[PDB]
Design a protein around this ligand. Structure first.
Ligand SMILES: [Cl-]
Ligand SMILES: [Cl-]
Ligand SMILES: [Cl-]
Ligand SMILES: [Cl-]
Ligand SMILES: [Cl-]
Ligand SMILES: [Cl-]
Ligand SMILES: [Cl-]
Ligand SMILES: [Cl-]
Ligand SMILES: [Cl-]
Ligand SMILES: [Cl-]
Ligand code: NA
Lengths: 161, 168
């Protein structure tokens, strides 16, 4: 239900399967990593997270393509797909989550509204994505995005194996 | 008790840090273990993050430190990850990766358990690396793991705020 409960449910499920997770964040700032590290048994399923807040960081740390960022922006399906692939490869994990969005109060230069967040969940190179538009102040958007990432991961585990 | 003080507030510190970095055209990067990304999260909650910060890592294990930050296996074997030598190497690795002016590394035992070498729970090492010039500090914070983490993040930032008032 709350962030701690969601994170505990993810941990138990991943540990039972012997799966490992990694994360790449932009707007959520390391709060997704923080939830996973606050969990009791972190090292049994997680050890690597990155925060890549700018286009240069995404290119440099995660090998996101310059052309992708210039054409689609950092807040895009293509960006989160590439972020997820980059972190999956760096960490040698089973599952990568990438999150990129506009926490607010400003939206994108291209008119993308504040609160728009893209997600990618990449299981061994098979990636699913979702765009959400969260209501609230910037800190509330971030908190909702972290919980969405975790809840959706919990839901997706079933169809993977 | 100016720098390690419950009378400090993390967002207030982050505001002061941002202004000082922006005024000098300096960029900050971070590498964390026990603090879990909460240091990055403070810096990213700050409103104009991109003007002074864009890269953080969380390297929760010895292997992640070797892989992501090129911490030497030998360093970890002799000194452990909760050590002066490790935070020095973490800070150098992230400074290089990010191309930043200043790197903070933090590595500790947040709790409830301590180190296998007997290091008490609550022991946290810090490194602040300004363009190569690295200073370190060992702290021992009281409280549960959530509390230790919050204190360590606040200390890292308060000490950075102080250092920014003197660096050149
Ligand atoms: Cl629970
Ligand atoms: Cl399971
Ligand atoms: Cl399995
Ligand atoms: Cl945490
Ligand atoms: Cl961002
Ligand atoms: Cl394209
Ligand atoms: Cl990569
Ligand atoms: Cl994989
Ligand atoms: Cl969608
Ligand atoms: Cl060596
Ligand atoms: Na200052």
């Amino acid at each position: 239900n709350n962030t701690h409960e969601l994170t505990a449910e993810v941990a138990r499920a991943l540990i039972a399967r012997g799966w490992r997770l990694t994360t790449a964040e932009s707007c959520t700032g390391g709060n997704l990593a923080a939830a996973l590290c606050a969990q009791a048994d972190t090292a049994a399923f997680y050890d690597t997270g990155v925060v890549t807040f700018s286009d240069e960081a995404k290119r440099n740390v995660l090998q996101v393509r310059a052309e992708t960022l210039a054409v689609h922006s950092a807040v895009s399906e293509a960006c989160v797909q590439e972020m997820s692939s980059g972190i999956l490869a760096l960490a040698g994990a089973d599952i990568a989550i990438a999150v990129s969005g506009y926490a607010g109060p400003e939206g994108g230069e291209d008119g993308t509204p504040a609160g728009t967040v893209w997600f990618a969940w990449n299981f061994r190179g098979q990636t699913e994505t979702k765009r959400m538009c969260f209501a609230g102040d910037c800190e509330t958007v971030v908190a909702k995005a972290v919980r969405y990432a975790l809840a959706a991961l919990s839901e997706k585990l079933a169809h993977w194996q």
